[PDB]
């Protein structure tokens, strides 16, 4: 319905060639994607995908 | 700090998942598939934020 979409941060790496860190994240269904995440997010955090 | 946002380029309700899947474009031009909340449409912007 109006549920939330979250993903646990499995892996995190600061790449000089990017302007936000890159994270391997695991969504609810167990699928893992590489995405950008805000500075300050660390391995073991949970990020939320939200509509602005 | 600096917010992380991405444009929803494409979107698809797969019955094999419990949230719709989107192709999104991050500010670096990179396009990744992720889950987005029910309600977002093509052209919306999503934020990735730590809860």
Residue numbers in the entry:
A (entry chain A): 4 to 55
B (entry chain B): 5 to 55
Quoted passage from the original study:
Here, we study fold transition between distinct β-barrels by protein engineering and structural biology technique. Here, we discover that the previously reconstructed ancient DPBB sequence could also adopt a β-barrel fold named Double-Zeta β-barrel (DZBB), as a metamorphic protein. The DZBB fold is not found in any modern protein, although its structure shares similarities with RIFT and OB. Furthermore, the reconstructed OB fold could also be converted to the four-stranded SH3 fold by a simple circular permutation. Thus, these ancient β-barrel folds (DPBB, RIFT, OB, and SH3) could be readily interconverted by a few feasible mutations through the missing-link fold, DZBB, indicating their significantly close evolutionary relationships.
